[PDB]
Structure formats: C-alpha cells, structure tokens
Design a protein around this nucleic acid. Structure first.
Lengths: 45, 99, 217, 64, 115, 131
RNA sequence: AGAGUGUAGCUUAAAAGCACCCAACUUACACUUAGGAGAUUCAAUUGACGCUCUGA
C-alpha cells in the first residue's frame, strides 16, 4: 500500500523535468530520486 | 526563521520559453478518461479494503480490552498507561535492494 | 473462578523491498510520466543538449552523447542486489531473509503433553509481573537471540479464551529493527510466515482470529 | 421574569459540548436544505405559514 | 397586477415571484419543481418519475425538456429561477436554463403593473 | 422578547466556538500536539504522503492544526575516490497530530508503518522546537 | 445444537436520502463543479442460504 504515496503528480506549474535517478547510500541500496542532470547511478561515499 | 521554498524562480520565469506545445488526440483522451474511471474504481476498492482492515483490527482490540476488563482492572491501568518508548519514534521506510 | 495465567507476543518484521506493481498501476505511472513530460519546463540536460547540437550544426555549416554513454556504462557495471530472496531458494522458511516485500510473523512449533498445538509463541505471565515485561523476557528466552525491536505501547491487541478452569491467550504487536540470530538450526521449529502461510499452517480458530488482526496489506 | 417554552425549543438536540466532534456543515446548500425542512416543520410559536398561507417490471427496468 | 411578496431583503432567496423554478440536485436524481409563491407545487419533473427513468448533465437537460413541455401544458410561461452563485456558474444549470428558454419558458418575469 | 416563551430562539454563539502539555491521568490519556516529520528527497512523494496522513487523520477524526514543512538542506559534499559536485534537496513535511489515545494511537502507528513509502523517513516527537 | 435474525456503510425510507472514491481550486483539508461505482440473499404472508451470540 506504499504505491499510493509513491505514485503522485506535481501539482505546481513551473518546474523542470523529473529524472528517476538511482541514489546509492553506503548501506548498499538504491532509491528513486528526482534529480536534474540524469546520472542513472548516484553514489554517496 | 521559516524560509519556505514556494517562490517561483525568476530564472525559470525568464527562460520558460522552450516547450509551449501540448497536443493530444481523440483516442488518447478517450483512453485517459477510461483509465481515470478504472483507477478511480480501483482506489475506491483499495480504500474499502483499508476500511475493512482497520475496523477488523479495531474490533479485535476492543474485544481484547473488554475481556481484559472482565478478568482484571490493574492490567487495564498499566495497559492504558502509555509507554515513554514512543517519544523518540524514528523509523525508516522500505528500500529497493538488500545490502 | 480459577483463571490460569497465559500470555503471548505476536512479533512482526517490517518489509524491506517495495511491493511489485500491477499493470494498471504501471500504466497509471506511465500516464503521470506523460503528464510530467508535457508539464515540465526548461530541463537543463535536454535543453543544453539541443543547444550544443544546434551550435555544432552551425559550426559545421559555416557532451550529451558521451555523457549518456558513460551513464549507461556505470548503469551496467553497477551490480544490483537480489530483489527476490524467496523463489531462488523456495524451501528455507526459517531464515530472516526469507521475504522482503511484505511483513513476516514469528511462529513456532513445540510439543506439549496433553496437546499437540501449533502456537504463536506463548508466555506465562505472573500476577505481579506486567505483560510488557513478560513479552520482553519471553522473547529473550524462547528466541535465544538479540532482537532490538520497537514495542508500540502497553495497549494490548488480541485476547481469546478457552475453558476446560480456564485460560486465555494475549497478543501484542512489535516490529523488529535489528536482529542478531544465533544457531538458526535449533530444535523449536520456528518459522517466519506470510498471511497465506498463516492461513495454511494454522489449525485453530484462535489463530484464525490472529490472522484477522495481523495486517494483510 | 421569564416563561418556560411551550414546547421543544430549536437547536436543543445538539447542545452537547462536543461541537468540535459534531458534523458541522461545511457547505451552504446542506444548511439550506435543513432550513427548508425546518421551515416546513409544525413549530409551536408564530409563523408566516400561520398568517399568510411489480418485481418483474423492476427486473425489466434494470435490464433496459 | 397581483401582488408579489416584495419583502425579505436580508434573507435568501427573494420571495418576489409568482412562479419559482426550483432544482434539487441530489444523489442519483435530479428533481425540478415549478411552484407558486404560496409553497403549493404546480408542475413537477422528476427523473425518479419511473417513465423518464430510462434513456448527470444529459439527465438534467432531459428533465428540462419534459418540464418545459409540462409548463406549456399547464399554461405557465414565466418563471423566476434563482440560483446560488456557484450553480449559477455550473455547467448543467446553464444547459437547464437554455433548455427551458428554447422549450418555451422565459426565466424572467414581468414587473407588477402598479397604477 | 425576554419574558416571552420564545426568548433566546435566535441564539448562535452557544453553537459556535470562537475565542500545551501531555496528560497521563490514569483512565483518559492524551498526548500533546506531536510533530510528524516526513523526511524525503522526493518533494512529490513527501507531499503525497503528507496529504495521505492528513486525510487519514481527518477521516479517523483527529484535529490537524498545522501541516507546515522545512525545506532543502544541501550539503556540499565531494565525490572523493577527481572532483564531482552533488547538491542535496531534502524536504520534511511537519504535521501536527492532536488527538491520541493508547489503542487508537497504536492503530494509527500501525497504519503509517504499514503505509511507509519508498525512501521516506518518519519522525514522531514532541513540539519543543523553534521554527 | 439453540436464540436473534436480513434494503451498498447507516436509516420511526419505500427501490429514497445521507455516506464512498476520482480530476481541478487548493501547502493541504474543505466547498463547488464534472464523473462513476454501488443494495431489498434465494425458493413460494412462509421455508432454506448468510452474520452475531450461547455451546461442544
């Protein structure tokens, strides 16, 4: 039932493209983040 | 010092002149409306599932409470005494890959 | 009215991986993505890509490609963890790493003398000892591990009665945060179960009502 | 001096303290419909009204 | 010549009419009454009338068409329809007003000829 | 009038209400207004879950006073192994919850922990802050 | 095995009215507008299929 909060639309009118980038913390997991300059892998040291 | 981030950037207000086109077709709009109907019905069913689950588990809690009342009151005292463990309640959501 | 004192603890383990979606919700996600495409303004990457493409066109008349290429290279060289740790083994119902998209319920089999009953782990609370402390020491004893887990409150969840002199079964809720398990191949047959696995394994209507108040999702 | 009312005064079923828990109309039309019903009610005091004023067919309907 | 009730200034709606068109947009049903000043309903048009129940904006328009025919039937030619600002602005009510106006009913009413 | 039996028929201020600690009494338990902080790197998902908890509290009859937020905390961290930049936009939806009992609070906590979204952190604590 | 029994969630309705969810205005809720989904459990005033309680 997490897909309700994981599925939404941007209610505002002036914003850039949403890129589903994959953030990787050092814990060893990926997460879908909205970041410009769409690097597919986005690793933290 | 509340500094909200609701302000529209003047940079975007200047350079917001790149994609002014929006075009849709008859069949695309029909699928939009029909899929909106199906999704509305689906979220209604999911909400009704949520309602059934919460009323079922509330029923289980209240029958547990009334059986505890008919067996002992001091367990009710220590049970309605709420724990201080709830004060630093800090939990994290689900991930995508295991470590 | 001799009331035999008997408690228990219904232990949960919160899910880790996201729930796989249905095609209808994936279609709705695609529709929202199309909304984002037609509503967004001034994407930095695509706008500078088009700008540099037109500028190199003018320069040859009178970078985005290699950056996308190395994005693809790091996407392929990044190894991903096993999303499904259930069907790859299909048999180890005992391990804590069994299933990750839905929660798990601790459950155990041990044999008594009068009864041979499949039991969500019971407890023998004292008249002077609180049921919270009974649950803590019960998890300390019969699970022989180091579970650091959150207890939500002193408010109970499920109470049921059986008369022979009578006794009751008392159930809380608790979710695990960090688990150190030792000697997993032990004698007491403990299984972490799903909702359908509960509905298959459970014999009595008492555990049927347990399956009612355990979250289904 | 006072005088007790000659019947049930209005707004008396909901003089509970929990007005924050009672339903509390958010619209205008819903109050308007309740007000229309009250204006039709009998009302012991003094009013403008006082002065001036088969199953087979159902199955066929469902199929149609 | 007859008196319209020309008071009630601080209270919505005005009771200055001879015939009011009232619309009840409830759940699953659209009702349309045409009533005298004195409360007495004159001509009704229900979608629960179990005849027009066969064959919602289009339901509202159909109630308008049957109501306009019934008003010409009863010899009523002028109304005072009076909507709250939001269903004045609403889409189905504009269709209802248009349906009655080209059904043969004017949603204004002549002023009372004094003197 | 006052002496007439229809006195007070037009009263309305007794019907309209118009003009913090935590109590642990022993039979009625009520926490003070507690802050949930929805920490997320995704503004859309944070707003969606804030709206979810708002309608959940309204449907389960919890008065919600404030639904405010604290924005981005970028940290200028380097990608040490060359130099690569990484800006961070975290946002926290801080919503107040007033009405809680023991069993009902457990129900609400169970619901939100079952409905925890992807990459969103919950923080339940008190109101002793300075916004 | 026995009692209470029966119109979608609810009704001193009889196929009605309130509830439900969806898109937009909303930080958000709400209002409003567009929608849509919904019940007299079956067999002739009766019996049986279904829920609750009391049992084993």
């Amino acid at each position: 039932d997490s897909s309700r909060a994981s599925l939404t639309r941007v209610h505002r009118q002036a914003y850039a493209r949403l890129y589903p980038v994959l953030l990787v913390k050092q814990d060893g997991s990926t997460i879908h983040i909205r970041y410009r300059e769409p690097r597919r892998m986005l690793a933290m040291p | 010092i509340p500094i909200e981030d609701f302000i529209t950037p003047l940079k975007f207000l200047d350079k917001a002149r790149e994609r002014p086109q929006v075009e849709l077709t008859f069949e695309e709009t029909e699928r939009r409306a029909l899929l909106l109907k199906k999704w509305s019905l689906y979220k209604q069913q999911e909400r009704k599932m949520e309602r059934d689950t919460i009323r079922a588990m509330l029923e289980a809690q209240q029958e547990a409470l009334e059986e505890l009342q008919l067996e002992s009151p001091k367990l009710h005292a220590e049970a309605i005494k709420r724990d201080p463990n709830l004060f630093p309640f800090e939990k994290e959501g689900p991930h995508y890959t295991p470590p | 009215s001799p009331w035999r004192l008997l408690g228990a603890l219904c232990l949960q383990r919160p899910p880790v991986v996201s729930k796989p979606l249905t095609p209808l919700q994936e279609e709705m996600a695609s529709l929202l993505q199309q909304i984002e495409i037609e509503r967004s303004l001034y994407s930095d990457h695509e706008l500078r890509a088009l700008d540099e493409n037109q500028r190199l066109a003018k320069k040859k008349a009178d970078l985005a490609q290699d950056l996308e290429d190395m994005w693809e290279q790091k996407f392929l060289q990044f190894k991903l963890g096993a999303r499904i740790t259930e069907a790859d083994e299909k048999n180890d119902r005992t391990s804590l790493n069994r299933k990750l998209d839905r929660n798990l319920v601790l459950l155990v089999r041990e044999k008594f003398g009068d009864q041979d009953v499949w039991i969500l782990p019971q407890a023998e609370w004292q008249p002077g000892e609180t049921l919270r402390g009974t649950a803590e020491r019960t998890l300390a004893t019969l699970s022989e591990n180091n579970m650091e887990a959150k207890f939500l409150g002193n408010a109970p969840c499920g109470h049921y009665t059986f008369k022979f002199l009578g006794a009751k079964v008392f159930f809380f809720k608790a979710l695990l945060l960090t688990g150190d398990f030792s000697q997993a191949g032990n004698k007491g047959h403990h299984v972490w179960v799903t909702k359908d696995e509960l509905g298959d394994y459970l014999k009595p209507k008492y555990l049927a009502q347990v399956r009612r108040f355990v979250s289904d999702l | 001096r006072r005088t007790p009312p000659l019947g049930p005064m209005p707004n008396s079923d909901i003089d509970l303290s929990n007005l924050e828990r009672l339903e509390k109309y958010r619209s205008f039309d819903r109050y308007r419909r309740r007000a229309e019903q009250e204006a039709q009610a009998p009302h012991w005091w003094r009013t403008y009204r006082e002065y001036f004023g088969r199953t087979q067919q159902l199955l066929e309907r469902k199929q149609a | 010549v007859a008196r319209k009730e020309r008071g009630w200034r601080t209270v919505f709606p005005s009771r200055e009419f001879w015939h009011r068109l009232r619309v009840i947009r409830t759940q699953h049903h659209v009702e349309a009454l045409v009533e005298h000043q004195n409360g007495k309903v004159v001509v009704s048009a229900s979608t629960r009338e179990w005849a027009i129940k066969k064959h919602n904006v289009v339901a509202c328009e159909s109630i308008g068409r049957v109501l306009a025919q019934r008003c010409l039937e009863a010899g009523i030619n002028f109304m005072v329809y009076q909507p709250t600002p939001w269903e004045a602005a609403s889409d189905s009510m504009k269709r209802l007003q248009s349906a009655m106006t080209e059904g043969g009913v004017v949603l204004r009413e002549p002023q009372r000829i004094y003197e | 009038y006052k002496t007439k039996p229809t006195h007070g028929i037009g009263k309305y201020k007794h019907l309209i209400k118009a003009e913090v600690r935590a109590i642990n009494l022993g039979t009625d338990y009520e926490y003070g207004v507690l802050n949930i902080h929805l920490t997320a790197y995704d503004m859309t998902l944070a707003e969606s879950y804030a709206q979810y908890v708002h309608n959940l509290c309204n449907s389960l009859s919890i008065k919600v006073e404030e639904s405010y937020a604290m924005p981005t905390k970028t940290i200028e961290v380097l990608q040490l192994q060359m130099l690569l930049d990484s800006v961070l936009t975290t946002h926290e939806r801080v919503v107040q919850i007033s009405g809680l009992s023991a069993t009902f609070a457990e129900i609400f906590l169970e619901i939100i922990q079952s409905s925890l979204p992807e990459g969103v952190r919950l923080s339940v604590k008190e109101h002793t802050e300075e916004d």
